[PDB]
Amino acid sequence: GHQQLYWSHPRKFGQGSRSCRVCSNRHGLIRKYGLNMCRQCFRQYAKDIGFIKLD
Amino acid sequence: QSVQVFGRKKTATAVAHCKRGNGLIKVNGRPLEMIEPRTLQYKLLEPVLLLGKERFAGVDIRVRVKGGGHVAQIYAIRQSISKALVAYYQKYVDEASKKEIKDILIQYDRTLLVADPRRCESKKFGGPGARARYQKSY
């Protein structure tokens, strides 16, 4: 219902447009390979995605 | 048709395609002496006068080289040329002349036909280089 006050400034060019896909975190977001992950969540689900610590 | 001999230094690698000829030497559109540096030129000339012009007078070898840097592209052309000559002689004419030239090249420079194993080392975080570390205050 809040459509005549919000959308007063389109949000598609800043860090507000991108959020962590797990905790809605806009800090420390990883956008490589479309991950859309934050560091804590990425290392939380690092082995599940396919990356493994070997180097 | 190549003698299938190759030659490397750093990430660079050169191979001398080999055929029967009269000792005309060419490096990627240019002969062995018109290489640009004109100060590394002696490094390219090392074999052809290390063993003489006569040995480079009955075989046509074209050295193709792909790699990084000027000097790293060198030490590949020369080693490829020398090791191509030694392999051509070994597989075609005899070993006695081949053994003589191999001994000559090794005595002048033992790394004349063996590759230089050294490669650039990886970089570790908390420092710009492989062994350099970021400065911090105590």
Binding site: - | G29, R30, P31, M34, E36
Partner: protein, 144 residues
């Protein structure tokens, strides 16, 4: 006999091509010779005053070494170090308009010209003349 381009010392070779370009005059006369700063990275004066002729000769050298080069590529052979002032240096592409005008000076003049489908075609007149220039440079004072 015959002598090609690549087996000639490139320094006096490009000097000879520049001199041949000055002597010919068959090209479009350059309209900017010193009013530009040439390369974007370069904020210092040009000197030779022949940079249009010498750059045309350089372009010809670069399409003979590598057929198919044009503007967008010519910028990539004429790019250089860019000192960003207080910040460190980087790489900068040259002037695409300058290389484009050089090509248009070359284009359709019967030594080299770039198509609209891809690649470079070399006419017999231009290649014969350039090989003869290389041979004259080689056998004149570079080989006896």
């Amino acid at each position: 006999p015959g002598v090609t381009v690549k087996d000639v010392n490139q320094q006096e070779f490009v000097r000879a091509l520049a001199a041949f370009l000055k002597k010919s005059g068959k090209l479009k006369v350059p309209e900017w010779v010193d009013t530009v700063k040439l390369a974007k990275h370069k904020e210092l004066a040009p000197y030779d005053e022949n940079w249009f002729y010498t750059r045309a000769a350089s372009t010809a050298r670069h399409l003979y070494l590598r057929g198919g080069a044009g503007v967008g590529s010519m910028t990539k052979i004429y790019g250089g170090r860019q000192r960003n002032g207080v910040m460190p240096s980087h790489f900068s592409r040259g002037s695409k308009s300058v290389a484009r005008r050089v090509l248009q000076a070359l284009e359709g003049l019967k030594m080299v010209e770039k198509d609209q489908d891809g690649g470079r075609k070399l006419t017999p007149q231009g290649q014969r003349d350039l090989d003869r220039i290389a041979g004259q440079v080689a056998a004149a004072n570079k080989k006896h």
